[PDB]
Amino acid sequence: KLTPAQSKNPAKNELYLVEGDSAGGSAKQGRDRKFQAILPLRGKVINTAKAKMADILKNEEINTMIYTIGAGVGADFSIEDANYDKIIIMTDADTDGAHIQTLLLTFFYRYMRPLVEAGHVYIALPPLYKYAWTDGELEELRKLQRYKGLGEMNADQLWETTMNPETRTLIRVTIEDLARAERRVNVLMGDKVEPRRKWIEDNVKFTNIQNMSLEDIMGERFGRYSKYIIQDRALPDIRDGLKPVQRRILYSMNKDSNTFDKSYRKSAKSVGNIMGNFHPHGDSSIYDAMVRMSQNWKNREILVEMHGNNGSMDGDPPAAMRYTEARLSEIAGYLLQDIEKKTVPFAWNFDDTEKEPTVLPAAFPNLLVNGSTGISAGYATDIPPHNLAEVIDAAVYMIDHPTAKIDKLMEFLPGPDFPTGAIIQGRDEIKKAYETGKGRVVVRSKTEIEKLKGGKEQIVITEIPYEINKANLVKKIDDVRVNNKVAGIAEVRDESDRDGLRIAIELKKDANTELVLNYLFKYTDLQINYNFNMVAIDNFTPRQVGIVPILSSYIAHRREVILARSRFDKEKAEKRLHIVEGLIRVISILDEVIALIRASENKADAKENLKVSYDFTEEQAEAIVTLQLYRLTNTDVVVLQEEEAELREKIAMLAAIIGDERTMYNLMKKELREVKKKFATPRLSSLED
Amino acid sequence: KLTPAQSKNPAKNELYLVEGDSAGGSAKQGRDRKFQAILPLRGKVINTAKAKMADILKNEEINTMIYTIGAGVGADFSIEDANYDKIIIMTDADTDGAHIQTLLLTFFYRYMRPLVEAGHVYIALPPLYKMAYAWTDGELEELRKQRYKGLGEMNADQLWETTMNPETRTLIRVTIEDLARAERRVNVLMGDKVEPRRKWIEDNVKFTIQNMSLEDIMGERFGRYSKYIIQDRALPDIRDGLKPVQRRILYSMNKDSNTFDKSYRKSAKSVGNIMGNFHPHGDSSIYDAMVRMSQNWKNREILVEMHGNNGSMDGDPPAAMRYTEARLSEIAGYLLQDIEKKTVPFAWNFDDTEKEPTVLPAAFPNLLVNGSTGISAGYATDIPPHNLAEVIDAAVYMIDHPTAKIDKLMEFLPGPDFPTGAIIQGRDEIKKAYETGKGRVVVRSKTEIEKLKGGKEQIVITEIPYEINKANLVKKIDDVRVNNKVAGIAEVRDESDRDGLRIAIELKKDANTELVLNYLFKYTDLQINYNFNMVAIDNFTPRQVGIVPILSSYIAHRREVILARSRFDKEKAEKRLHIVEGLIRVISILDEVIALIRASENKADAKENLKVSYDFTEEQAEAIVTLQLYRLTNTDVVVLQEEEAELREKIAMLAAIIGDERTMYNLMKKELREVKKKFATPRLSSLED
DNA sequence: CATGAAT
DNA sequence: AGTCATTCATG
DNA sequence: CGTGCAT
DNA sequence: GACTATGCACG
Ligand SMILES: COc1c(N2C[C@@H]3CCCN[C@@H]3C2)c(F)cc2c(=O)c(C(=O)O)cn(C3CC3)c12
Ligand SMILES: COc1c(N2C[C@@H]3CCCN[C@@H]3C2)c(F)cc2c(=O)c(C(=O)O)cn(C3CC3)c12
Ligand SMILES: [Mg+2]
Ligand SMILES: [Mg+2]
Ligand SMILES: [Mg+2]
Ligand SMILES: [Mg+2]
What we know:
2 copies of one chain form a homodimer.
Chain A: E1 14-18, H1 21-30, E2 36-40, H2 53-57, H3 60-69, E3 86-90, H4 95-110, H5 113-117, E4 121-124, H6 135-142, H7 155-163, E5 170-174, H8 178-188, H9 194-203, E6 209-213, H10 214-232, H11 244-255, E7 265-266, H12 267-277, H13 283-292, E8 304-307, E9 325-328, H14 330-335, E10 346-348, E11 355-357, H15 366-369, H16 388-400, H17 406-409, E12 423-425, H18 427-436, E13 438-444, E14 446-452, E15 456-463, H19 470-483, E16 489-494, E17 503-507, H20 513-523, E18 527-533, E19 535-538, E20 541-544, H21 547-588, H22 590-598, H23 603-614, H24 618-625, H25 638-659, H26 661-679, E21 686-688
Parallel strand pairs in A: 1-2, 1-3, 3-4, 5-6, 12-21
Antiparallel strand pairs in A: 4-5, 7-9, 8-9, 10-11, 12-13, 13-18, 14-15, 15-17, 16-17, 19-20
Chain A binds 4 DNA strands through helix 4, helix 13 and strand 18.
């Protein structure tokens, strides 16, 4: 796995720890083989502060590093009998690169302290533009090619920028204070989450060879990584309930006109467009997210319609993106409704070539309807799906009554509504969840006892808990029968066809079916505990939220959308109305206008003449001057006046929405009810206490 | 890997052999678990009538097919011990599916004869269309009163209802009518003898429940696969020298404006667009093809420029399409020159939503310049790269002298010009190759001797034979030292860097350096034999062609392109002249026309009046009537008469090309010389005899 | 045993 | 993101 | 131990 | 085209 140097020399030999096999290859190509060695770090280096000391020793990356370095580890470590003068960590210039640097540094600190204390650990700093490393260097170089990673850099460019000892700009790792360094590393990388959460809260603001400390290097790297994972990866926006990857998937597919009323496009075509325009990451990661939105046992209201093998409840792999074809679902269209009307904040992509929405208009409150999950850094998320009609009903009520209480809201939104059905138990815990954000509810399979011939009964499962694998469940129940942990099971039988779920647990003659069913509920996943952990992104910061701040954030959002949409349509109507006013007046003086253009020197002089001599505005003067010749035939002013009437009425009703809070909220309620009527579906999960 | 039936029954159990894992997964969901078992066949099945029996027994696909059939194989085959009553083969509707059916049928023939003789071996026929479903184009025509490209685009419920439901499926019963003729049919198609197969293809293939015989099924299936892979996969077109996948890559990237003058584009975005619009195959195959066109040690003139790790001469894996950026090279633009002018026959793609070029205009003879290779069915190709300037000079001569002899052409085209360089020996065999298509020439590494200290010498290799892996060569050379197959080798060192190839073979003190160098040339790969096998596609058929059928077919192609282009520009200039002629008349009667349009009631009326009153044509009247108002200012009649003159001359020069074979041929030469001057590059390979 | 578009 | 196996012609 | 976006 | 290991919070 390691590319070694030509000659052995522990006085000049350098070890390059490269992030990735591709970048490892590029390094291997652009290196100096006389003394430079390459070691690909395939994946993320294990946490040698969290993981056990056994599984740490059973790690491939760690072992081949301890072998390539050739000095041992822990207390059996002799820096004198090493193999390298310098060990350089070369990663991508992005956030995940900063995470690898963090993980690798904690390794070389916890188990190879003398190597770091002797200043033998370095950090290669690849350029960010093309050469510039900062924004100030770009400014000075302006008097560009943004490197998305090491993969986009050539071998000769790699050497000239970051590998040549005379040209490279390294960051030397030094231990200034062993006490403050021990504290920092142990907090950021410890098993305890709470000190890490607090550190992120207090520090991270969400708004040729230099030497850096350990505390500074661990702070700038884990600080850069934490902020990006919370804001721009794992956690959903509190409004549209989407992670950046899902929003980019829905938007790109919509921009490519890949909607529900059109033909399916090949998945790879969509995935490729997402990656080249908005989401600068792996094709597999994007596709796996695209597939999940097509699975109706993961989402209560699917956003993608996919043809072919997209998986099952048995958890078998979906067809590769070379096979499947996809398109947005009809209800996914409402998430993107009026996006063409400046109703949402847009920001530049990584490419700085095209703008992308930071949030979707969300004509329906997706965050509650579909849910989210949900593993960040310092924070985590688990929001269950809900009924489309019920959430809307609660939303409509809160629109009328902003200061509504949870007890009243639960008359409309009684609890979660899993797409997999099953039984939810714990009315008290549901309330606790809708208030504080956290809460532990019990999810139970829908069962039915069928009596067989011979005095023997049979348990028949028809629905299973959310996020539970059907195939793994059957195996676990069968293991109970095989091991005879409990007595009475004759045969476990998955009888689920393409049109129904059915797990049949046939029991022996004279066997307490109550004793068995109770055992399977406790020791298998027939019954599970579902933990609420409703955390989302409100105002760029992570926020644990109940049912109230969620609904309030959605209402506040839809208000902005409706207001912005109204300004947009009013802007269009005004501009035409202004043009129609001019055209009507033109007909009254058609002869003198044509005579004026006839006397004009050019297009610009013609418009300037229309302004001065006949008080037409710039916008009007443009429309008049660019009229096709045949429009001189028409002198019917009546039809244009009918358009004036229609436009003036539209501007009026639009302005009232912008000017009257009540009128606006009435509109919002009207649309939320239409969405309800169109996409209403009965409950699947029963509620008990 | 096998999904067994829930109930073992050698009377009703079916065994579906599915092409691919994903399709096997879809079948695993759409099956009836009571009696339908699934066995996914991953990749093409081994040719059991072509490979050594030792390799056959080691083939895991065969072993897992026998051990699940439960009846052994060969002479030790009890037909009553089988666990399945029916064995259905379910492949895609495409030609590769027909190949698998062929390979499988020969196995069940050779090693399981009683199984096929009992009529238990079936062939499942998937639907081809979906509007209900239809298997034939006639059935689609009747159903008219979704084109499936495989099984990966079908849902589980769809696959069941159409091909898996035993009461609603179309099956093919494989019956062996005669054991005599079926043997010759099997051996000719699958046997180790290539010549009889090539003859059978040239004799049968026209290049332009329900029972079925074995000889008929084998001929129909393999016939389709033979034809398809011959003219639509492995072999290049004789005109633009491109395989279908290479042509689709170039056209797609050019259509997406991913060219040399513009920014680089993420590779996955290009691959996805190709796969979804033109080339209905795997992403890796398309990307690998795209990567090769970027490697400057395989192509004499790269057609794709690529940023990042695109591999090396050591054979190390290039970066995945997630990492790399790419765009068309400048010279690749000349392959697509004038494609927007209907100079090339187009054809519908697989979606019938977009038309693709069947051949590129090719402003330079790409077949000889870049070469091709080169493994089809019944045929194979191997054309070496040539110098761009030399091939053009050869073609230019043949334009003036159609009946040019080979000995004369070689004064301009002396031989191949490998991008890897090295030495070519064998003037005689080159001529034999340029005449017949086949030839065996010798390629020798470029070496030099460097005197060292202590009286030692050092062999230095700077250039190596075409298509030779540098990493393996060094290993094989060093293996000579290790095994001491020749005396005097001290150390083998690859000293190549990012700007120079260098393999230093350091010798010992008193060692015969001439002896060492001679042994390596003969027993390693410092010297190899390049075998010409110039086979291309001429008139939809594979043709073993010499240097003359190639150059002539290119000139013939360039003729059609230039003729079709000249007609395009002429019709364009004609219609434009027609308008200019009318606009000049209008100026002299501007007021009368404006008054005439004002007097008119509408657009249609205005044109009829422009016709009747001033004899303007319909095309002329339309142009006048649709002029924007400001055009009444730009009333310069002279600059219109300049365009009029400029157009009449352009038509005159274009008509001369269409109406004179010589003037057209001079245009070929003029343009070919321009291409030559722009992309001229010195030889890299030296020639000897 | 490689080569290169396919599975 | 690398690894793993087969087709096909051919020396 | 599985979860779902990342390496 | 499936297989294999890491992060991160959490019962
Ligand atoms: C499972 O088939 C493949 C294999 N194998 C064949 C053997 C089967 C049993 C034991 N494992 C190996 C793995 C392989 F080595 C490579 C590829 C491959 O590169 C590829 C592609 O699209 O680029 C596609 N496929 C699938 C489309 C056939 C490959
Ligand atoms: C080599 O890393 C990966 C592994 N491995 C990690 C271990 C390292 C030593 C060898 N064995 C395993 C293989 C893996 F199991 C899965 C994926 C993976 O799914 C994936 C993706 O984009 O979808 C990307 N990568 C690469 C981007 C890191 C994966
Ligand atoms: Mg990266
Ligand atoms: Mg993955
Ligand atoms: Mg196929
Ligand atoms: Mg492959």
